[PDB]
């Protein structure tokens with residue numbers, strides 16, 4: 045292929061595995077299945093793909109976890125593949141390594157953390173119910189657009205104090221950063237997201253509100269006032285986390301539930317298992333994969349890594365690794381030890397994971413109680429999409445209104 049970058053002199057020929065992050069060959073089998081090919085019998089723990097400019101890929105949880113823990117060798121400064129995206133990526137605190145990362149992470153944690161989630165609980169609850177009830181009698185829906193997107197996004201926009209009418213533009217921009225269609229480079233999408241924020245940040249620094257943006261813009265980092273530039277780099281990240289994470293996960297989960305009546309019946313019969321089901325689904329349908337850049341030449345697991353080399357450390361793969369979970373592709377709500385790195389690992393552990401679990405658990409509970417029985421629209425060929433964050437293109441669902449019930 046002409047999409048293969050010349051193999052660098054230091055990368056062993058036998059370690060080449062041309063996996064394409066943005067268009068994995070086995071995509072038709074499902075995105076997680078497509079990435080799992082990296083864990084087949086004769087694939088080593090660490091491989092090099094010539095796709096997307098050329099980069100390393102850790103295929104097992106042991107290495108993924110080790111690398112995320114060693115920020116001195118594996119820096120978050122250039123976290124995205126391709127290298128151009130990684131270089132343009134300057135969100136805070138994600139593009140920083142400890143120790144400088146911490147003072148900013150603390151502030152971000154204050155705007156989307158548990159205390160904030162507890163506060164949003166009732167509104168999250170109300171929106172879920174409102175959306176599901178309006179869909180209930182129709183006996184059908186395009187899940188991605190009718191629920192997966194509006195539910196998590198409106199909650200984030202509510203938190204950020206931003207008008208919902210701005211969602212089409214913002215969502216388009218965020219998606220170009222994770223699963224670009226080619227219309228925009230990462231740099232262009234980032235510049236447009238920042239352009240959107242600049243005047244809003246200025247406005248709220250002059251007249252502070254109680255929304256997440258105001259809190260960030262008027263916040264302090266270890267005692268000193270955050271700058272306009274810093275607030276922009278943090279708010280941009282929050283927007284991406286709010287618009288392109290839970291939105292995708294919900295569709296993976298609901299697609300699975302629509303194709304598995306037995307699992308639905310398990311949660312219907314024993315709803316107290318929903319939280320556990322949530323964690324198991326987060327493992328099986330993990331969907332994130334970013335990485336790091338080598339700060340210096342370093343021998344890792346018998347492989348010579350060179351300064352500047354990029355290494356993809358798929359958060360998605362840890363929990364799908366059979367060395368972490370037996371029968372990894374099987375969904376077992378009773379799974380004894382659900383091992384995964386779905387929300388990351390190390391100093392950059394996901395800050396929105398608490399908001400995320402709340403949204404997921406609320407969805408499972410409120411949907412199954414009103415629409416306990418549903419399936420994929422007949423003949424529908426569900427398509428997944430791969431990138432920094434993977435997703436589902438469309439999920440047409442159907443059900444008999446007669447089997448539903450208002451709650």
Ligand code: HEM
Nearest residue numbers: 137138282285286289290332359387388392394395396400
């Ligand atoms: C199912 C949903 C979600 C998944 C799977 C997810 C996953 C992750 C992962 C893998 C990381 C670490 C990446 C790295 O180490 O470079 C991370 C970081 C982060 N996430 Fe989430 N996330 C989710 C939802 C959210 C939401 C709803 C927000 C809220 C805006 C959010 C905010 C953040 C922030 C601010 C960080 C940066 C932490 C840091 O760099 O110190 N996430 N997330």
Ligand SMILES: CC1(C)[C@@H]2CC[C@@]1(C)C(=O)C2
Nearest residue numbers: 138284285289332334432
């Ligand atoms: C890898 C992520 C899921 C995490 C939150 C949004 C995201 C795309 C980032 O840039 C950090």
Ligand SMILES: [K+]
Nearest residue numbers: 052053054055
């Ligand atoms: K070589």
Ligand SMILES: [K+]
Nearest residue numbers: 121130131133
């Ligand atoms: K960078």
